[PDB]
Design a protein around this ligand. Structure first.
Ligand code: HDD
Ligand code: HEB
Ligand code: HEB
Lengths: 443, 350
């Protein structure tokens, strides 16, 4: 009956929950890999404490990332059956290739990185985290090309004698114009998220440690200042990359999807009505407009939340010029306020992208065959409202409780700080064939 | 010859790997509570024993559960009609299975972050729920799939209460699957531990031997008499012989490797029998034996099947190789007096 609005709400809620945690993982895996490589190279135990202190947080995030992602795999067939019959022939290949080529790698090798701190040689233990860091980007590429088929589809035929998409070329699907730009933009966003996270955490701990004095006043200059500088440089280069990839992706959006563009730069001639008449003459009657309010303000918020990390990075790179250490109270508050803004910008961008193509679930390609198209009213499953209210309420409640617990754990472990006093030298890793009293990790 | 039949076989192999590698996961999850409870009856504290039980599937459980994800993805890629119909028909079962899996995933990995005794009770409850629920619901789902569903004309399986939980042949499937997974996990823990949790695992397996035997025997006979071809007699005989061998080996108390090979054979034989009692079609229809999906009106297309065949025949052997290697690496043995002291933060659960 009214299962359409409930299904849309459910899918949106769940994907936003998932992408709250995705970018931190994608951006923090390579940073931890670099922090471990610079320790294995130089031998300075300062980066060992940093890589452990951030590995704990990385794992706390990875658990809930996997848990939130697990449902998206089945939601397609559960709530969107008629859509899955239309695009299954094509949509199923990137998903299965992702499952076979990235999920297996990351899942198998993070378990080796967690438990092999004193069982594997050091070079193998470093290769483990490098493999994890590459796999968490391969999976992003696969899934983003999958989504980029839904808007500007390329390699399909639409066999009429069966009513299906029917894939015809995999090379044309994996080298899509939209897919490359979307992948680059999303990777830049994830790296911005992780860089801001590291820089703000280390800036807070640098302002806090300098005031304590005693013995910890020497951890600042040796450990918290270099990490802050690294984070700020990563943030700046990610901001420039975001600007350029976004300009490219906007140039793309102008030509292959004009309704989204006309809805982004709205007043607050008209475009949205001439395109309405054009689409009504092309594809019969119907209403072909997005919300015009969410689409107007998500673009603005996504672009405007970039001024906070940029200003923070530019101020932190100047407050620590030669070798000095900042002690201003307002700097720590600024570092604390700068943390949620990358998450907010990522969510705003993904909400603009998704709710902009809104009457469609497979957008008609202006230079395609015009038969590969599907509004989001012929894609939803035929269920009752009482069956969808159950899933919506259950998922919303479970994910809300898990997110509150996740925030509590991250705040606790950030306030605790790096357990430098709690036995953090480089582990000796003695050879095997010995009943060592601990195992170095046991869940 | 027959890319469609080849991909039927490949989907069967993915589900077989999932069942084989999650059997002892679900068994350990079901049994860790009793492992802890058997230590208090000796006077010792139960926390090292519960940690030693959970630690046998420490580094491998995530890679184990990826098999279900890749099996669902392979269904969506090769047989999208079966994917759509099956997952929109079994809506409540999938909803419950997913709500349990979420809790298990998050509890296993957040259990040891805080040192409060009340924080560990909810983690243990989450592990228990996420191990008990799928172990029954997957057997129920596959038994109902082999028995048949009400596919109306093209799609839209709408079943209420007697097509999903038909007492005959469907709850028996869930009971048999739960008992078999418990036995599998008991004899798996009996092989990765070193001296006093090993004897507890042997006791649990000696208690579980006969019920699992009787349940899987009854389920196999019922399946092969109601829905069965001529070459599945061999699979049923193999499963029965393997279960007898495993029982005889467990009641001795010294083999522990043959007793695991035998239970692996039993699980594989159950899966192979369910799929071979179904091969020609997918989701038979109880309304009309013409409205039922098959591999002939449910597959994708020649090109997609060829591309997926290349991808699978390139990536699956490598996955098997390096997962066998990671099982070899962490396979020394685990004692109860070898678990590190709990190192977690202070207090104030949530
Ligand atoms: C930018 C790339 C990207 C995007 C847009 C998505 N994911 Fe995701 N997903 C990831 C990339 C990723 C990840 C960030 O790499 C995760 C998070 C934590 C992790 O370890 O992997 C992950 C975890 C993850 C898992 C856990 C599997 C495992 O145990 O390794 C599954 C099944 C999915 N995702 C599926 C999906 C589906 C069906 C999505 C569509 C809405 C989706 N993800 C959004
Ligand atoms: C966060 C954010 C986000 C993300 C990440 C996403 C990711 C995605 N996505 Fe999106 N979506 C969205 C945001 C999103 N999304 C939303 C919000 C929704 C709901 C709403 C509407 O649509 O209206 C969606 C919904 C959706 C759907 C259903 C239909 C409609 O339209 O409704 C689909 C199919 C999709 C596809 C997708 C894919 C495949 C992916 C992976 C790549 N999506
Ligand atoms: C954080 C990070 C970030 C930031 C800062 C942003 C800010 C921005 N951005 Fe954003 N975005 C994003 C991340 C972002 N973003 C994302 C992730 C998204 C969604 C996804 C895709 O790509 O699709 C977006 C969405 C988006 C899009 C899409 C559209 C379509 O659909 O096609 C574009 C073009 C953009 C550009 C941009 C620019 C130019 C800027 C300024 C510089 N973006």
């Amino acid at each position: 009956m009214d299962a359409l609005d409930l299904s849309r709400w459910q899918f949106g809620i769940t994907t936003v929950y998932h992408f709250i945690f995705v970018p931190l993982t994608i951006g923090l895996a390579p940073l931890i890999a670099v922090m471990q490589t610079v320790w294995v190279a130089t031998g300075n135990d300062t980066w060992y404490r940093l890589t452990r202190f951030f590995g704990k947080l990385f794992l706390i995030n990875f658990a809930i990332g996997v848990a939130t992602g697990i449902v998206q795999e089945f939601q397609f067939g559960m709530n969107w059956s008629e859509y899955s019959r239309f695009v299954g022939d094509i949509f199923g290949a990137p998903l299965a290739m992702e499952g076979l080529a990235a999920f297996f790698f990351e899942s198998t090798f993070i378990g080796l990185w967690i438990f092999g701190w004193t069982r594997l040689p050091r070079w193998l233990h470093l290769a483990c985290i490098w493999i994890v860091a590459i796999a968490v980007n391969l999976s992003a590429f696969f899934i983003i090309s999958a989504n980029s088929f839904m808007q500007h589809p390329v390699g399909a035929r639409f066999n009429p004698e069966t009513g299906r998409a029917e894939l015809e070329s995999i090379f044309a699907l994996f080298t899509n114009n939209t897919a490359i730009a979307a992948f680059t933009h999303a990777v830049s966003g994830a790296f911005l998220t992780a860089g801001v996270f590291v820089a703000c955490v280390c800036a807070w701990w640098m302002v806090r440690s300098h005031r304590t004095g005693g013995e910890s006043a020497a951890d600042a200059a040796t450990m918290y200042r270099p990490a802050t500088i690294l984070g700020c440089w990563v943030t700046l280069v990610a901001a420039v990359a975001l600007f350029f990839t976004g300009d490219a992706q906007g140039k793309l959006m102008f030509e292959q999807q004009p309704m989204k563009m006309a809805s982004a730069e709205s007043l607050c001639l008209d475009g949205v009505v001439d395109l309405q008449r054009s689409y009504e003459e092309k594809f019969g009657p119907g209403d072909y407009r997005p919300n015009l309010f969410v689409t107007y303000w998500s673009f603005r918020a996504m672009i405007g939340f970039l001024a906070v990390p940029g200003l923070f990075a530019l101020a932190a790179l100047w407050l620590t010029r030669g070798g000095r250490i900042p002690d201003q109270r307002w700097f720590s508050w600024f570092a604390l306020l700068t943390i949620p803004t990358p998450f907010l910008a990522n969510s705003a961008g993904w909400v603009f992208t998704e709710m902009g193509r809104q009457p469609w679930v497979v957008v008609p390609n202006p230079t395609g065959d015009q038969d590969i198209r599907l509004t989001v009213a012929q894609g939803v499953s035929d269920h009752s409202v009482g069956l969808v209210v159950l899933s919506l309420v259950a998922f919303t409640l479970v994910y809300a409780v898990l997110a509150v617990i996740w925030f509590f754990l991250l705040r606790r472990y950030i306030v605790q700080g790096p357990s430098e006093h709690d036995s953090e030298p480089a582990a000796p890793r003695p050879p095997d064939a010995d009943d060592v009293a601990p195992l170095s990790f046991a869940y | 010859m027959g890319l469609q039949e080849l991909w039927f076989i490949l989907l069967a192999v993915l589900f077989l790997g999932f069942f084989l590698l999650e059997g002892f996961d679900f068994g350990v999850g079901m049994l860790m509570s009793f492992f802890g409870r058997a230590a208090e009856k000796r006077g010792q504290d139960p926390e090292p024993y519960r940690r030693a039980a959970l630690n046998t599937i420490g580094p491998v459980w995530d890679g184990n559960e990826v098999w279900l994800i890749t099996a669902g993805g392979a269904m969506f890629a090769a047989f999208p009609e079966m994917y759509a119909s099956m997952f929109s028909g079994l809506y409540l079962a999938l909803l419950v299975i997913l709500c349990a899996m979420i809790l298990r995933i998050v509890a296993i990995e957040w259990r040891g972050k805080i040192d409060d005794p009340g924080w560990r009770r909810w983690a243990d409850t989450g592990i228990a729920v996420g191990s008990w629920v799928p172990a029954i619901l997957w057997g129920v789902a596959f038994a109902s799939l082999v028995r048949g569903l009400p596919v109306d004309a093209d799609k839209q399986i709408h079943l209420s209460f007697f097509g999903d939980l038909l007492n005959a042949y469907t709850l028996l499937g869930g009971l048999a699957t739960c008992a078999l997974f418990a036995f599998h996990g008991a004899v798996f823990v009996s092989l990765k531990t070193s001296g006093e949790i090993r004897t507890d695992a042997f006791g649990f397996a000696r208690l579980l031997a006969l019920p699992a035997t009787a349940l899987v025997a009854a389920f196999g006979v019922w399946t092969q008499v109601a829905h069965g071809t001529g070459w599945t007699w061999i699979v049923l005989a193999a499963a029965v012989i393997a279960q007898l061998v495993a029982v005889a080996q467990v009641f001795r108390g010294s083999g522990e490797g043959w007793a695991f090979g035998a239970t692996s054979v039993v699980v594989a034989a159950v899966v192979v029998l369910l799929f071979g009692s179904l091969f020609p079609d997918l989701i038979p229809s109880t309304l009309n034996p013409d409205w039922s999906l098959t591999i002939y009106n449910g597959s994708s297309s020649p090109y997609t099947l060829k591309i997926m065949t290349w991808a699978a025949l390139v990536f699956a052997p490598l996955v098997v190789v390096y997962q066998g290697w990671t099982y070899w690496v962490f396979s020394k043995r685990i004692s109860a007096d070898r678990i590190p002291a709990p190192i977690g933060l202070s207090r104030r659960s949530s």
